[PDB]
Write a protein that binds this ligand. Sequence first.
Ligand SMILES: *[C@@H]1O[C@H](CO)[C@@H](O)[C@H](O)[C@H]1NC(C)=O
Ligand SMILES: *[C@@H]1O[C@H](CO)[C@@H](O)[C@H](O)[C@H]1NC(C)=O
Ligand code: NA
Lengths: 105, 105
Amino acid sequence: GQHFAMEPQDQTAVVGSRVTLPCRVMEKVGALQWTKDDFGLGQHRNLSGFERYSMVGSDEEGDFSLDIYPLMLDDDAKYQCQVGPGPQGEQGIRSRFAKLTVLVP
Amino acid sequence: GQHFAMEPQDQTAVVGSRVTLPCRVMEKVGALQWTKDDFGLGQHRNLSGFERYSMVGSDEEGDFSLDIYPLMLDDDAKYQCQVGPGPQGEQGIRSRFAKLTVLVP
Ligand SMILES: *[C@@H]1O[C@H](CO)[C@@H](O)[C@H](O)[C@H]1NC(C)=O
Ligand SMILES: *[C@@H]1O[C@H](CO)[C@@H](O)[C@H](O)[C@H]1NC(C)=O
Ligand code: NA
């Protein structure tokens, strides 16, 4: 079944930098999406309106990491990697929540 | 900018019945999506992967209410209607949370 090969971890970073929240999925059947404070960022890598977020990894590798750049204070939140159910009855999955902390020097 | 003309409220319903959670957005610019216990259900009206759920209403009335039939005990959860940011900076919005309570006959 579909499952995480890698899940995001708590991170602390400095404003202005790039951050990568890791998410790798094996045997992905459902549609994938990140939540930020439980707000859905978009499925199928389509993050319209979030000009500083992207998901440039490849499907083959199951790379669905979230990149953020440049980091801003508003990005200080809790993030989760989500995969919806498959068309064949495959259940969806949810990664641990990762707390992204933003510092200012 | 985009705003809610209707938000979902708490409902109690019995297994087997139809339940529609209302969501209406005027001047909608972003992509709308429901969450179920903070899990994004999808950004298309058909909501693939959730075989008993769909989003009903006309785009011209910004009606994207969450239609559930037949109701199952699995549907007992908290629901939110969300609209993502627009392509021109317009900020996303989030409805109140509606608690759906499902009873057995
Ligand atoms: C992503 O969503 C936007 C907003 O609806 C749409 O205009 C665009 O075509 C989509 N991008 C892709 C590659 O599907
Ligand atoms: C659901 O809607 C999307 C967008 O219109 C479409 O790509 C997809 O094929 C639809 N699903 C079915 C089963 O028709
Ligand atoms: Na569906």
